[PDB]
Design a binder for this molecule. Structure first.
Ligand SMILES: Nc1c2c(nc3ccccc13)CCCC2
Length: 461
């Protein structure tokens, strides 16, 4: 009984469709009401509710909130929630208010701070001032019952800060495969001089590392395509730039092979790399090669595809078919394999862009910003799927020169992506013109043997 005036404490304005909307279905019938949307004020009140704990909302909120609220604003709202004014005295009660309202709300805030530093410390890593505000506030908290919670948050922060201020094989990894390029000779590194097995291994290790660093929150609210993308989505942007560069590198290697026999040997080696990606459950790599071969500059090279060994063309068509019918066969395959694996990342992006586009950010902006929370629950269920393959490392040894090589691929050089893709298209028309004549005969500029060592481990034995 008796809360402060909504006038002096914004959270306790009465619930109405002006400020908060609950699911009204058979699921929402039992237990804790399900939030469909509200003002950020009302979402914060329900995140820290006096009447019950809501672990599920806390988890979904801290995954999704940056799509509707800045980290600095979240901290300001949790402090505002914490600083609870006394009710209007009546002057002819406090003791109940402190036991049943204040203490439970303050404990629930400290529990949100605890989940925040435990599972989303990257917010504080990205913003040292945010951490200064949090540390200053937590150390101001003097409540007897708050003490265990403050100690717990302090210890998490101490640990996260330690594990910032600075590989272990559970079984023998395979020996590194070498072909024409030899170690230390990084300047001789090329698609055709490195071993196709080890190209697939080193790209898988790199792609696995990029994949495992992507936080769900980098995807929520299409934040990687927005103004604050370099800070909200740094891991995702690195993974997207990697995919772009590698896909364009594969295209470049094919289209710049002017000599027909060389270009066939290049496409054949890329298909061999694709088979080792498949053996490694690197569907990310499989579908990068699919992306390259379906690019307009390569797709149209009918003479090159027709010249492939039937078995190589078969393997490619099968890879290509994984992507057909909204990735139907890819999704069957992904559910059938044993990790480690690198999921095709592009499809999470596609399905989040469609959910982001097809659902309003706001239940309405008339009179109030009424945030669509249900939209964020649906995106968090998609981002949730990214997590099940981030926990299983590859049993493969890093080749530091090859890793360096692949981290630094820059097919575009100083040109724009559009200038570069125009170039690939113009070169495609040069090497295989739109006429019915046999393909032009250009000389090789490279002197290395075209003969593949194949994808049976050599040094392995
Ligand atoms: N252009 C292509 C041809 C074939 N497969 C292809 C597969 C993917 C992208 C382009 C292709 C089979 C042989 C004929 C041409």
């Amino acid at each position: 009984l008796r809360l402060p005036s909504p006038e002096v404490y914004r959270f306790v304005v009465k619930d109405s469709e002006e400020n908060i909307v609950f699911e009204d279905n058979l699921q929402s019938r039992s237990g804790i009401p399900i939030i469909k949307g509200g003002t950020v004020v009302k979402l914060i009140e329900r995140l820290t509710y006096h009447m019950y704990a809501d672990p599920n909302f806390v988890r979904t909120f801290l995954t999704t909130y940056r799509s509707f609220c800045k980290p600095q604003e979240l901290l300001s709202l949790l402090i505002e929630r914490f600083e609870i004014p006394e009710p209007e005295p009546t002057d002819a009660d406090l003791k109940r208010f402190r036991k049943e309202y204040v203490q439970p709300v303050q404990l629930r805030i400290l529990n949100v701070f605890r989940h925040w530093v435990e599972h989303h410390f990257y917010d504080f890593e990205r913003d040292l001032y945010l951490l200064e505000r949090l540390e200053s506030f937590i150390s101001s908290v003097r409540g007897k019952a708050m003490k265990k919670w403050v100690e717990s948050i302090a210890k998490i922060i101490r640990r996260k800060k330690q594990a910032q201020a600075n590989i272990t094989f559970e079984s023998p990894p395979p020996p590194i495969e070498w072909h024409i390029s030899k170690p230390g000779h990084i300047e001789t590194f090329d698609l055709m001089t490195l071993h196709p097995i080890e190209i697939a291994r080193q790209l898988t290790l790199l792609e696995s590392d990029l994949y495992r660093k992507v936080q769900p929150s980098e995807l929520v609210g299409s934040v990687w395509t927005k103004e604050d993308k370099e800070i909200n989505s740094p891991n995702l942007l690195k993974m997207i730039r990697h995919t772009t560069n590698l896909t364009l590198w594969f295209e470049k290697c094919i289209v710049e092979a002017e000599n027909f026999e060389e270009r066939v040997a290049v496409l054949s080696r890329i298909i061999e790399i694709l088979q080792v990606f498949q053996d490694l459950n690197n569907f990310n790599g499989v579908l990068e090669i699919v992306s390259a071969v379906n690019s307009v500059s390569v797709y149209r090279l009918d003479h090159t595809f027709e010249a492939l060994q039937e078995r190589k063309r078969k393997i490619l068509d099968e890879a290509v078919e994984l992507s057909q019918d909204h990735f139907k066969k890819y999704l069957v395959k992904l559910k059938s394999i044993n990790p480690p694996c690198v999921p095709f990342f592009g499809i999470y992006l596609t399905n989040i862009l469609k959910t982001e586009e097809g659902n309003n950010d706001f239940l309405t902006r008339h009179g109030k910003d009424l945030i669509n929370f249900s939209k964020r629950r649906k995106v968090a269920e998609i981002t949730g799927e990214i997590q099940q393959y981030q926990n299983q490392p590859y049993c493969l040894r890093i080749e530091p020169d090859m890793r360096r090589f692949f981290e630094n691929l820059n097919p575009m050089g100083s040109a724009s992506e559009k200038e570069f893709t125009d170039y690939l298209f113009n070169k495609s028309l040069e090497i295989e013109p739109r006429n019915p004549k046999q393909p032009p005969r250009f000389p090789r500029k490279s002197t290395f043997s075209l003969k593949s060592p194949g994808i049976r481990p050599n040094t392995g034995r």
